[PDB]
Amino acid sequence: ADLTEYLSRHYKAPRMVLAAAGGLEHRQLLDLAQKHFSGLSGTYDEDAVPTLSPCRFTGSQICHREDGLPLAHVAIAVEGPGWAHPDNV
């Protein structure tokens, strides 16, 4: 039930993209999308709540000390801007 609810909650048309690349033609893919995919948001929710809240970044450290391991792994990072920001280039 936890799964079916997560599915219903999320595998909804407007958050899905059917993508393809190769020796195809757009119309064939569109036709197929209409043939095999029509009937997903024949519903579409009233007050559901699919919104994403921003995530607080914290200047912090986590150290898992294990002298039994032969080499150290270390990963440092500062807060990035996000997919949309042109600063990414």
Partner 1 sequence: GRQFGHLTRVRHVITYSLSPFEQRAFPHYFSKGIPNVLRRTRACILRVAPPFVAFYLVYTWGTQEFEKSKRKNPAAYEN
Give 34 or 58: the residue with its C-beta nearer to partner 1: 58
Residue 23 or 54 with smaller CB distance to partner 1: 54
Pair 10, 3: CB distance under 8 Å? no
Stretch that binds partner 1, among 14-22, 27-35, 43-51, 57-65 (CB under 8 A): 57-65
Q: Cα(26)–Cα(14) distance, rounded to whole angstroms?
A: 19
From residue 55, alpha-carbon distances to 83, 85, 87 in Å are 14, 16, 19
User: Is residue 61 close enough to count as binding partner 1 by CB under 8 A?
Assistant: yes
Residues forming the site for partner 1 (CB under 8 A): 58-68
